[PDB]
Structures are given as structure tokens and as C-alpha cells.
């Protein structure tokens, strides 16, 4: 432990900002003595041998709240000469030696990404995201954060880069695959609302490659359909939904999930006279499904869950509502 | 060795630590944590744990809300008791005695023991308010929390009336009611201190049946043993 000699540099670096704040009338001298003592206690806690990511986050939160306090006080005392750049630089320094000391803590990596995104640092955010993905490649949350922020920026090629490396790594759970199909169809909806893409064959290709993965269950394909069934206002949405249903019917013929997609298929983009027409079609499918030879307890639990989802909406007729209740109660 | 006697009295009357090993030992004395952990604890960790304890105590009873402002304050994280003057120290002693009278009823509970641990580890109540702390733990003299308080008490800081506790500090066992009652019949100071503590509580209406039964039993047995001592047969001596 050379921690005193190690923290001497960080205190001597933070000193001239305190000299500027003392030569302005923004912080008084007793308050600056308090800032000196608090930063000194924080540095000698941070550079200690036995340290913790919560200790690094407490120091980050204190420095960021000091920047916010000085911003409020500077706007109140009407000064424009004092800048926040030194505080952001030292907060980046705290975070860089934080991710040096504890690279295996995703809470601290995500706090670093939240800070770098919040003070408008996109290129630095991309570099931090690359380092975090290299250290935690099995983390679907980090991969979806990278891909969704690249899609939110609009660099769809970079979003596909992050997502295809993520689906190359995370193949135990379906989560990142579902999020990639969600992002690709959101790109398809953006390409539609801007008015290949005319076919929209990429989620069908995602399904065809996902057919051979170690998570490939009927529940996983039902999760694929439950992702796909949102935002039906598209062009090839009936093509995608019909391909999912014929895939599940050709592969898992008598599963309750396949009977559930047989129930809930024809209600794609409905909200309105086309609503109860397709509801009567789907209820015919549902009655045939309930009488048919399938695990009725599993199919009934699926249908009462979907019927709670149905009952969550207003603006319907009471006869339809009470016949949903009557068909619910005997399950 | 008259000079060694004068310096021993000065060192016993001194209150603040002046070398690093003394500061580390005085910071190590705690109720809850073992000493190896309690050395390396800043006053934010202790305040977080013991303020969770005081939040539980303030949700139990209503009348802890002034101590929420004066004793368990986020500014009271930082106040050093040995750097304030005599009147600030006396007002802090009044606030501590009021809290100890208030917390004596719930002292078997871990929230109240966490609150007393905050007072001990910040304001050093085991050194500066040994009388009121030892009196408010005396009705619970059969519990391991009293054994731990007896362990962390300084020896020369105990008042003269409670110096029967020295073999129970040398061997960490809880003292029995026979020892407390026998020292009450022998010393009038211990009986006066117990009765003064419970009457000063009962004037502030912070009584509880454990304290009332404790004082009633010990004054009954002490007056019993005191009459059996006072009986003499000679007329003027019995008068």
C-alpha cells in the first residue's frame, strides 16, 4: 500500500479547480475545506487494497452530484466562465480505474455506459461498449443495449454487427434472438414508415437458422410468435406469421403452444368491424382446440393467460365479455 | 511515586485518545460487530446500519422523532464530542439521558440495540455517560447484551457505586440479582442510584413494567437486608 503517495496525484490534480472556485465567489472557504476532506477520504477509500464496485459508484455519484450542485450555484450566481469539463474528465478517470480494478461487474459497466451516454459521449460510449462486450460476451443485456443504441442512432449495419456477434455467442437462451428479430422488424417498420426490404426475408431467415439451436423448444417458438405478433401494421407480416405457424405445425404438431398459435393466428393487425369477425374465427379455432386431443390443462392455462390479456382492454360488448367469463370458469 | 500517582490520575481523567493505537482501540469497542471488523468501519457504514435500526424504532414508537433531528442526524455523523465546549457537552448529555430513558423499554430488541450501538460508536456513551447507560442496562442484567456492554465498558470510567461489577468484567458472566441486592444493602449509593434513575424516568412518564418490577424487587430485598443489618438490640443504636 502506497495509497497516500498514489492519491496525492489525484488531489493535486483536483486542486486548481478548487482554486478557481475559491477565487470566484461560488464556494466559500469552509465549504472548500469540506470538499477537500471529502475527496481525500474518497480517494483513500478508492485506492485502497480491499475495495468494491459500490465504493467506486459512491465516489462517482458524489463527484457527479458536486458537478450538478456547482451547475445550480453557477446559474444562480450568474457566472458563465466556469466549465464542467474538468469534473467530467475526473469522473471518466474514476470510471476507468474502476473498470480496471473490477472488470467482472456488469453493474459498474452499465453505470459507466449510462454516464457516458448521459454526458453526450457517443464515440467514447462505443469504445466502452466494445470493452464491456469483450469482457462479458455471454451477456444478452449488454448485446441488446449495443444493438438497440446503434439502431436508435440509425447505423443499422453496426447494429447488425453487434447483433450477429451476439447471436453467435449467446445461444443458450432465446432472449437475444428474440430481441434481434424485434430490432430487424422495427427496422422493417421504419423502412415502411419512410414511405430485400420488399420481401422482408430476414426474420424468416432468423427463424430458419434458429430452428437448429440448443434452445429450440416449442415454448421458444411461441416466444418468437409472441414477439412477431406485435406491430402487425406491415406488408409481409402475414407471410412471417404464416411461416411461423406452418413451421410449428410441421415440427411440433400436437403441442399446446402450436394449438395456441392456431388459436391466436388470425388476430394480427386488428383493433372496428374486422375485430369481432376475426374474434369469432379465433373462437371457433379455440373451441376446436379445446375439444381436440391436446394437454387441456396446459392449453387452458395458456388461454386464461391470454384471456387476462384480453380482459385488460376496455371498449367491448358485455355479451362477449360474459361469454369469455363463462368459457374461462370451467377450465 | 507521587508523580506516578498524579500522572495516573491525569491519564484516568483524560478522555480523548492521543495516539493511533488508542484511537484504534476506542473505535474498536462495539456492541454488535467483532473487534476485527469494527476497527475498519467508517462513520457512514455505522450510520447506515444504525439508522435502519432507528427507523425501525421510530416506526415502533412515536416519540423518537426529536432524536431523529438531534441525535441520529446526517450531520450527527460528523460531530466529535471532545471538540465541543462544556455547555455543548452538557446539553448532549441531557439529550443522551433522555434517549436512554426512552429506549430502556425496548432494549431486548435488535433495533434498539442498533440505536444504542450508534450512540456508543459515535458519541462514546460508554465513556461519557457510563452512569445512565449502566443504569438503563441494569434491569436487563441477565442478557448477552448486558454481557457485551459489560465487556466494552472501561474499568475506571464506572462510577464508584457500580464497582461490584469488576469480577464480572474480569470473567465475562452476567451478574446475579444476589450480587446486585447484596451491594444494594451494603452501599446506600447503589440503591439511591437505582431509585433515582427509575424516579427520573417515571417523572417523564417513560416507565415500563420491567423497570418498575426491577426497582420494586431490589428496593424490597434491599430494605429487608438493611433492616436485618440495622437491628442491634442496643436501644440508642437501634434508634
Amino acid at each position: 500500500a502506497w495509497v497516500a503517495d498514489k492519491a496525492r496525484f489525484y488531489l493535486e490534480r483536483a486542486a486548481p479547480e478548487l482554486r478557481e472556485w475559491e477565487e470566484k465567489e461560488i464556494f466559500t472557504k469552509d465549504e472548500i475545506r469540506n470538499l477537500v476532506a471529502k475527496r481525500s477520504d474518497f480517494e483513500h477509500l478508492v485506492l485502497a487494497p480491499g475495495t468494491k464496485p459500490t465504493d467506486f459508484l459512491n465516489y462517482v455519484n458524489w463527484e457527479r452530484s458536486l458537478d450538478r450542485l456547482r451547475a445550480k450555484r453557477c446559474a444562480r450566481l450568474n457566472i458563465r466562465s466556469v466549465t464542467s469539463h474538468a469534473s467530467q474528465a475526473r469522473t471518466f478517470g474514476i470510471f476507468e480505474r474502476a473498470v480496471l480494478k473490477h472488470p467482472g461487474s456488469i453493474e459498474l459497466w452499465l453505470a459507466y455506459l449510462e454516464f457516458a451516454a448521459q454526458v453526450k459521449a457517443t464515440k467514447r460510449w462505443r469504445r466502452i461498449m466494445t470493452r464491456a462486450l469483450r469482457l462479458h460476451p455471454m451477456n444478452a443485456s449488454l448485446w441488446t443495449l449495443a444493438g438497440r443504441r446503434a439502431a436508435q442512432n440509425g447505423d443499422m449495419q453496426r447494429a447488425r454487427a453487434h447483433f450477429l456477434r451476439g447471436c453467435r455467442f449467446c445461444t443458450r437462451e432465446p432472449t437475444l434472438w428474440l430481441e434481434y428479430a424485434r430490432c430487424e422488424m422495427d427496422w422493417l417498420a421504419r423502412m415502411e414508415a419512410k414511405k430485400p426490404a420488399l420481401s422482408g426475408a430476414i426474420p424468416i431467415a432468423v427463424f430458419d437458422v434458429a430452428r437448429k439451436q440448443p434452445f429450440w423448444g416449442p415454448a421458444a417458438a411461441e416466444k418468437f410468435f409472441d414477439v412477431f405478433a406485435k406491430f402487425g401494421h406491415l406488408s409481409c407480416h402475414e407471410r412471417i406469421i404464416s411461416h411461423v405457424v406452418t413451421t410449428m405445425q410441421e415440427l411440433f404438431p400436437n403441442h399446446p403452444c402450436t394449438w395456441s398459435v392456431h388459436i391466436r393466428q388470425p388476430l394480427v393487425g386488428v383493433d372496428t368491424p374486422a375485430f369481432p369477425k376475426a374474434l369469432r374465427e379465433s373462437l371457433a379455432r379455440l373451441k376446436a382446440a379445446l375439444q381436440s386431443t391436446t394437454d387441456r390443462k396446459a392449453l387452458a392455462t395458456k388461454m386464461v393467460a391470454w384471456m387476462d390479456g384480453i380482459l385488460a382492454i376496455e371498449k367491448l360488448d358485455a355479451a362477449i365479455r360474459t361469454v369469455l367469463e363463462h368459457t374461462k370458469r370451467s377450465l | 511515586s507521587s508523580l506516578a500517582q498524579q500522572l495516573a490520575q491525569i491519564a484516568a481523567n483524560s478522555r480523548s485518545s492521543f495516539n493511533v493505537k488508542a484511537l484504534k482501540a476506542s473505535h474498536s469497542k462495539s456492541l454488535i460487530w467483532e473487534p476485527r471488523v469494527a476497527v475498519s468501519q467508517t462513520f457512514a457504514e455505522i450510520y447506515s446500519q444504525c439508522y435502519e435500526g432507528f427507523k425501525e424504532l421510530c416506526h415502533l414508537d412515536s416519540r423518537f422523532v426529536p432524536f431523529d433531528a438531534t441525535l441520529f442526524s446526517a450531520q450527527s455523523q460528523e460531530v466529535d464530542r471532545t471538540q465541543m465546549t462544556a455547555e455543548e457537552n452538557a446539553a448532549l448529555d441531557k439529550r443522551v439521558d433522555s434517549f436512554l430513558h426512552l429506549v430502556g423499554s425496548r432494549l431486548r430488541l435488535m433495533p434498539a440495540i442498533k440505536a444504542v450501538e450508534w450512540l456508543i460508536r459515535r458519541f462514546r456513551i460508554h465513556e461519557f455517560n457510563t452512569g445512565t447507560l449502566l443504569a438503563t442496562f441494569l434491569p436487563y442484567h441477565t442478557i448477552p447484551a448486558f454481557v457485551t456492554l459489560l465487556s466494552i465498558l472501561p474499568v475506571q470510567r464506572i462510577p464508584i457505586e457500580y464497582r461490584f461489577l469488576d469480577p464480572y468484567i474480569k470473567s465475562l458472566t452476567p451478574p446475579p440479582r444476589a450480587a446486585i441486592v447484596q451491594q444494594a444493602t451494603n452501599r446506600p449509593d447503589l440503591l439511591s442510584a437505582i431509585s433515582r434513575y427509575t424516579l427520573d424516568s417515571c417523572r417523564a412518564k417513560q416507565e415500563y413494567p420491567g423497570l418498575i418490577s426491577f426497582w420494586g424487587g431490589i428496593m424490597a430485598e434491599a430494605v429487608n437486608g438493611m433492616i436485618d443489618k440495622m437491628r442491634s438490640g442496643r436501644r440508642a443504636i437501634q434508634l
Binding site: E31, N34, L35, K38, W62, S65, L66, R68, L69, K72, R73, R76 | P66, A69, T70, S73, A74, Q75, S76, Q77, E78, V79, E88, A91, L92, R95
Partner: peptide, 27 residues
């Protein structure tokens, strides 16, 4: 007052509250 409540909360968190601790003591 000329101070926001969020500014006073940041002042009590960042800078310390020793003066109001002494004020809460002497009551």
C-alpha cells in the same frame, strides 16, 4: 430563500450538513 429544494438537497448531500447538525443539537 432564493435556493431550490433540489439545490438544498444537493448541498446537504455533497457539501455536508454540520451547521444544521449543530442546530438540531441545540434545541
Amino acid at each position: 430563500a432564493e435556493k431550490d429544494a433540489e439545490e438544498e438537497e444537493l448541498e446537504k448531500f455533497v457539501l455536508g450538513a454540520k451547521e444544521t447538525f449543530r442546530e438540531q443539537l441545540f434545541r
